[PDB]
Design an enzyme around this catalytic site. Structure first.
Site, PDB file in Angstrom:
ATOM      1  N   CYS A  30     -75.710 -56.046 -80.289  1.00  0.00           N
ATOM      2  CA  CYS A  30     -74.464 -55.242 -80.170  1.00  0.00           C
ATOM      3  C   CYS A  30     -74.201 -54.530 -81.509  1.00  0.00           C
ATOM      4  O   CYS A  30     -73.996 -55.182 -82.525  1.00  0.00           O
ATOM      5  CB  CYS A  30     -73.310 -56.150 -79.752  1.00  0.00           C
ATOM      6  N   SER A  84     -63.982 -54.267 -83.662  1.00  0.00           N
ATOM      7  CA  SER A  84     -64.913 -54.294 -84.788  1.00  0.00           C
ATOM      8  C   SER A  84     -64.238 -53.796 -86.063  1.00  0.00           C
ATOM      9  O   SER A  84     -64.469 -54.473 -87.083  1.00  0.00           O
ATOM     10  CB  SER A  84     -66.208 -53.591 -84.411  1.00  0.00           C
TER      11      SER A  84
END
Ligand SMILES: *CC(=O)Nc1ccc(Cl)c(S(=O)(=O)NC(C)C)c1
Ligand SMILES: *CC(=O)Nc1ccc(Cl)c(S(=O)(=O)NC(C)C)c1
EC number: 2.5.1.18
Lengths: 239, 239
Positions: A30, A84
């Site tokens: 990812c 993130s």
């Protein structure tokens, strides 16, 4: 190696995070989670990793993140942080050592404004991996070239090797994962008209933090083949 | 009143920002710019306002912001900051007084994670103003209700009147502009199943900063009628 195997549907909910460590819920391929992992490595933060099988997610994972996405940080106090860019900023602020974001408000704003210049790229990479023929691929390369030109201008103006200066900083780690994936997607020719960006990618690959987390093109390929075959085994490619 | 008239195609590029002031390039009915203006008022920051005619933009405005969008901050040193959330964070960090973002890294991350819970709403308001019949409007109300339920859960869990605590803080100002516009869009019934969010809107309207910047429904209507008629006069509604 087997330590890294993902937890999926049916896995036991994990125990508390030990004092002295932070936990990342991640997935090995990812690029959003890779942001968080670059920051953890760059700052020398003791941590543990739980990989999530994003094709076959544990129902307990929605208690970590109602969106059911990685990355997620969990600390010994039981605080949960997701998205993130938010996980990265948190780590930079909560942990000692090298500040990856500048203290100066304007210079920090500049790093976020570059992040914004970059913001179309993850959606193009998401569209790219789906492309079906030479015509779609020609069109996709022109879309990458238009975004890359915007990033080339920043390096042109600053005459620094990195987006935040002559030293690697948070903005470089936040954009790197998508450049890492360009060779494997056969999109490497989209940096040809952006020479400063092409040197930037070489500089990044020399960075101790980047190098330590780089995945081989072979490994990324084996993953994407299974992800696109819709395989619950994609996230555990190679083990 | 006439002081507020927008600068459009053909206007002279403006002079430098005086020492002691910051300049916002704004538009009086833009909810993104209203974020920046709430922060300027909440922190008591001396500033000047240039309104941009977003239907008839000056070519010089692209030198302020290559994206050609408001809000943009410009200071006496000539630094330019754009993207609404970035302008707000910058002001909170660069100027003295009441910190609208918490110092604590986790509590600041929490405010950004709420901002993320809110992130679908500006696109729905953008789609809403276009809706054409009772069927599209029913569908649009259900989409608002699903996003509002996510925000209701935050207030449920915290049992605070505001998203950051019992005192108004940056997250409240960052989401307020879209709630301000709900009456005028006839989307007021979408808070009926979210009682804590309905009390939150009443609390916000009592805030001295919110109240000082609130636009009448009449004024917002006159604007939207011209914006949707594709009028270069929309941004200067009422003068
Ligand atoms: C964690 C993760 O893999 N997130 C993710 C979300 C969307 C997209 Cl598009 C990607 S990808 O750019 O790696 N492309 C594939 C569809 C997974 C990753
Ligand atoms: C500054 C500004 O008005 N920005 C803006 C951008 C997109 C959208 Cl959709 C809006 S709006 O939500 O007010 N709807 C109209 C299309 C202007 C505002």
């Amino acid at each position: 190696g087997e330590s890294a195997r993902s937890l999926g549907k049916g896995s036991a909910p994990p125990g508390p995070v030990p004092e002295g460590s932070i936990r990342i819920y991640s997935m090995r391929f990812c690029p959003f989670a890779e942001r968080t992992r670059l920051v953890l490595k760059a700052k020398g933060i003791r941590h543990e990793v739980i990989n999530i099988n994003l094709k076959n997610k544990p129902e307990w994972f929605f208690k970590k993140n109602p969106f059911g996405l990685v990355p997620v940080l969990e600390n010994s106090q039981g605080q949960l942080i997701y998205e993130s860019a938010i996980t990265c900023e948190y780590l930079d602020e909560a942990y000692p050592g090298k500040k990856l974001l500048p203290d100066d408000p304007y210079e920090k704003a500049c790093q976020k404004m570059i992040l914004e210049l970059f913001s179309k790229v993850p959606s193009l990479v998401g569209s790219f991996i789906r492309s079906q023929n030479k015509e779609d691929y020609a069109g996709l390369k022109e879309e990458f070239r238009k975004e890359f030109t915007k990033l080339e201008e920043v390096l042109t103006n600053k005459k620094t090797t990195f987006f935040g200066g002559n030293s690697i900083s948070m903005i470089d780690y936040l954009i790197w994962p998508w450049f890492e994936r360009l060779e494997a997607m056969k999109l490497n020719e989209c940096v040809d008209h952006t020479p400063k960006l092409k040197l930037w990618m070489a500089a990044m690959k020399e960075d101790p933090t980047v190098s330590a987390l780089l995945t081989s093109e072979k490994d990324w390929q084996g993953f994407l083949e299974l992800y696109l075959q819709n395989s619950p085994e994609a996230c555990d490619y190679g083990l």
